[PDB]
Design an enzyme around this catalytic site. Structure first.
Site, PDB file in Angstrom:
ATOM      1  CG  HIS A 199      28.096  36.392  29.538  1.00 17.27           C
ATOM      2  ND1 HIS A 199      26.765  36.240  29.861  1.00 17.27           N
ATOM      3  CD2 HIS A 199      28.363  35.465  28.589  1.00 17.27           C
ATOM      4  CE1 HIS A 199      26.248  35.262  29.139  1.00 17.27           C
ATOM      5  NE2 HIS A 199      27.196  34.782  28.351  1.00 17.27           N
ATOM      6  CG  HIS A 222      38.675  37.325  36.949  1.00 17.49           C
ATOM      7  ND1 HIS A 222      37.338  36.994  37.029  1.00 17.49           N
ATOM      8  CD2 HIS A 222      39.084  37.566  38.218  1.00 17.49           C
ATOM      9  CE1 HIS A 222      36.963  37.035  38.296  1.00 17.49           C
ATOM     10  NE2 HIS A 222      38.000  37.386  39.033  1.00 17.49           N
ATOM     11  CG  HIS A 278      36.902  38.368  31.972  1.00 21.16           C
ATOM     12  ND1 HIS A 278      37.586  37.191  31.784  1.00 21.16           N
ATOM     13  CD2 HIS A 278      36.268  38.248  33.161  1.00 21.16           C
ATOM     14  CE1 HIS A 278      37.360  36.377  32.801  1.00 21.16           C
ATOM     15  NE2 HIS A 278      36.568  36.994  33.662  1.00 21.16           N
ATOM     16  CG  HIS A 295      33.696  39.535  36.975  1.00 20.15           C
ATOM     17  ND1 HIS A 295      32.715  38.626  36.642  1.00 20.15           N
ATOM     18  CD2 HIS A 295      34.878  38.963  36.636  1.00 20.15           C
ATOM     19  CE1 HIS A 295      33.282  37.550  36.119  1.00 20.15           C
ATOM     20  NE2 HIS A 295      34.592  37.729  36.107  1.00 20.15           N
ATOM     21  CB  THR A 336      30.673  32.570  33.945  1.00 23.77           C
ATOM     22  OG1 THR A 336      31.976  32.190  33.464  1.00 23.77           O
ATOM     23  CG2 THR A 336      30.874  33.990  34.401  1.00 23.77           C
TER      24      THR A 336
HETATM   25 ZN   LIG Z   1      36.044  36.454  35.499  1.00 30.56          ZN
END
Ligand SMILES: [Zn+2]
EC number: 4.2.1.1
Length: 257
Positions: free
Chosen positions: A61, A116, A91, A93, A196
């Site tokens: 992801h 994040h 991580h 996005h 998520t």
């Molecule tokens: Zn995130």
């Protein structure tokens, strides 16, 4: 299972995770015209001096940089938080193009990516227990804009080819997350959720006002990873962001005038 690819994307998540239509889902649009300054809100305390990075991995992801969270080595305190929160992973996005990629928006404007840094409340003993509680997690969100290269991000970029596909992992020690922060720690905060699945409403969001700059070359490396596992039909890891959710009855507070 779930993903971001039209047939299994965010618009389908509610069927498996009904909390997707919950009362405090994330991300949200931050409307500066209605985000009020809160004098009671205190300054953030980020103590990342002795952060200990362990490894980096592609989970299908995004890619997560994991830290050793056995002790209070890299913690977030203050701001709207009641206790001590330990850094477990960070991580990003990001989008397929520079004009999209962030989860949160500011006056509807999107950034190229969003970082994040995920922390968990030390009173629950571990991340697994904390993720289930309303005050269990704190996530520091930092927007990325395209411009000059971010020197502190290069170490991460220089390893992505080695974790190109799902399930791939690699040792990743001596990484200093202080190199990813902006100069200012001014922020907005609101109660939200994981963006998520399982989408639990256990997150206190702290979104920094000041973006960091990264080069077109660095963000291009992100877009070269794969959602798919080794051998499967190639799906480039892009647009792994959830669209803004309804604010409903929450108020976003600002730490600055
Ligand atoms: Zn995130």
């Amino acid at each position: 299972h779930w993903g971001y690819g039209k047939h299994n994307g965010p618009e389908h998540w509610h069927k498996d995770f009904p909390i997707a239509k919950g009362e405090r889902q994330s991300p949200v649009d931050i409307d500066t015209h209605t985000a009020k300054y809160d004098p009671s809100l205190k300054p953030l305390s980020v103590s990342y001096d002795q952060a200990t990075s362990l490894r980096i991995l592609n989970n299908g992801h995004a890619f997560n940089v994991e830290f050793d969270d056995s002790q209070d080595k890299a913690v977030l305190k203050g701001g709207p938080l009641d206790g001590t929160y330990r850094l477990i992973q960070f991580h990003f996005h990001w989008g397929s193009l520079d004009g999209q990629g962030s989860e949160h928006t500011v006056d509807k404007k999107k950034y190229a990516a969003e970082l994040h840094l995920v922390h968990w409340n030390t009173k629950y003993g571990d991340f697994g227990k904390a993720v289930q509680q309303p005050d269990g997690l704190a996530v520091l969100g930092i927007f990325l804009k395209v411009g000059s290269a971010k020197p502190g991000l290069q170490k991460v970029v220089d390893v992505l080819d080695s974790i190109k596909t799902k399930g791939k992992s690699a040792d990743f020690t001596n990484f200093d997350p202080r190199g990813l922060l902006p100069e200012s720690l001014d922020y907005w905060t609101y109660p939200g959720s994981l963006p998520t699945p399982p989408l639990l409403e256990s997150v206190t969001w702290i979104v920094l006002k000041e973006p960091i700059s990264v080069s077109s070359e660095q963000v291009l490396k992100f877009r070269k990873l794969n959602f798919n596992g080794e051998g499967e039909p190639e799906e480039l890891m892009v647009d792994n962001w959830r669209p803004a959710q309804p604010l409903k009855n929450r108020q976003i507070k600002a730490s600055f005038k």
